[PDB]
Design a protein around this ligand. Sequence first.
Ligand SMILES: O=c1ccn([C@@H]2O[C@H](COP(=O)(O)OP(=O)(O)O)[C@@H](O)[C@H]2O)c(=O)[nH]1
Ligand SMILES: O=c1ccn([C@@H]2O[C@H](COP(=O)(O)OP(=O)(O)O)[C@@H](O)[C@H]2O)c(=O)[nH]1
Lengths: 268, 268
Amino acid sequence: QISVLSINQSLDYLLEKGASVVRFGDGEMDLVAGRSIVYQDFDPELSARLREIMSMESDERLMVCLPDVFTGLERYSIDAQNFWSLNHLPHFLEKYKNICRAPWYGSTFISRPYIDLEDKTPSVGYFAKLKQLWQDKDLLIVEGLTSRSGVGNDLFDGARSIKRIICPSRNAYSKLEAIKQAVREHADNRLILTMLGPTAKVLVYDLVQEGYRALDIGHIDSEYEWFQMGASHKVKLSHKHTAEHNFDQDIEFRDDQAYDSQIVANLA
Amino acid sequence: QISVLSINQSLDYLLEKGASVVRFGDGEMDLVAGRSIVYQDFDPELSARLREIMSMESDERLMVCLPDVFTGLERYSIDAQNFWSLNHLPHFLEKYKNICRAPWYGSTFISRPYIDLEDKTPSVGYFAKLKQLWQDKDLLIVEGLTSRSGVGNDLFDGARSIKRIICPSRNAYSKLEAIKQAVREHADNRLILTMLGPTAKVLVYDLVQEGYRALDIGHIDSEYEWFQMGASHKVKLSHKHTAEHNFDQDIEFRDDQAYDSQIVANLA
Ligand SMILES: O=c1ccn([C@@H]2O[C@H](COP(=O)(O)OP(=O)(O)O)[C@@H](O)[C@H]2O)c(=O)[nH]1
Ligand SMILES: O=c1ccn([C@@H]2O[C@H](COP(=O)(O)OP(=O)(O)O)[C@@H](O)[C@H]2O)c(=O)[nH]1
């Protein structure tokens, strides 16, 4: 009964208002139910902070997103439909309805705009509007050791410049205050992008309170790689993190000197 | 009946396929009916050429566009509804059905994404996808003397570089071969954008046959100015051409040194 914007309306709101964004997906609900996820062990301080931010209302300073799953599941792949309609919502729908009482939310799938869409025709337009958020911007990327967002592809080639804060690939929440301090030291006037699972959501909220603009964009790199491959399955990549292969086994980095030169702090 | 894509679907096609685009609006149908328009006098070679291009089918090399008016006019302002439904289509509907027999067409309103829309919420996203077509590209802009596309706004600030071929502000068709000659001399590998009324349509078509990529984007600058000012009416601008003020009275150019430096040929 919760009202969730489409991807097109969510991205347009970010383009219109310049708002920050924080997204909550199935893994955040897992932790709010007291259950660990693969790259974040359960932590009560984390779950309470996630439990708090989910209940917040959206405005021109910060848009809060939920999975666009409370209606029209025919939009998604048969595997995605089976997950939401037969696994997640049976468990947690009454939790969503209890906690999430804002008038409206953005779509958490602005990060996930390809592989699980039944019709992939509009994906090109989603990635185009995403790229417009950072076109000609100086960027601060806050991501984990294996994320390597944009490494090996042209996702961020339209940005003016990139600096990166490298965080733990898992259980990053225990270093949250150290990460925040690194962001303060290096952010200047840059747009902050974060790819950091549950920790990213607390990070964005906290940095918004300090007057930064930050976008939680999660697994955008994996979805972009699949989009460029024309993939039909969540094919695992060998040289960086892959969405829904969250244990990070069988990864060996390729030498990227541009990436290495963008690192300004390493907390992994 | 004729099947016309939405603006969202048309822009996504150009992003996906990299196709060139030609759009036909009410002024071209005016000429195909043997009538002069304000900035283009009747010429039998032009009108026959426009009718010929209108009848062509769209593909990954070239998308042919028509006004998205044969259905769902509730999408537009009442002024636009009255024009198409009581003025244009009463005269020319049987001509459209006779000439336009392709399976599908793009939307000519990819150039017109704001002032005549009833709901202006998605316009921000339309301009974002348009900007992505030329982001980080070297551009060759082919336009009339009063067009001054991008002058005084940030429409093309995301482009890598701009050269301009300046043409007659009206009756440009009489200089078509000289304009084409200028394009061959200065285009190199640049993306060609044209804002040149009915001559733009023949130009793009002819340039496609020679293996260039060209986008007929017409009155995009006026719609962007209205969008940025949040206008609710087609307010006339005093320092350049304004769409639907086509006689070009009462125009005094602002001195723009970037514009001046971008001109590489002048045929006005
Ligand atoms: O402690 C953590 C948790 C996650 N991640 C990264 O967070 C990203 C995914 O974030 P999120 O779960 O928000 O993605 P979504 O699937 O929601 O789009 C991936 O690049 C992971 O490597 C990380 O670096 N450290
Ligand atoms: O001989 C001409 C005819 C038109 N134009 C320009 O063509 C543009 C509009 O093109 P079009 O009619 O294709 O616009 P649309 O309304 O279809 O988007 C305006 O900038 C006009 O100044 C021009 O420079 N020379």
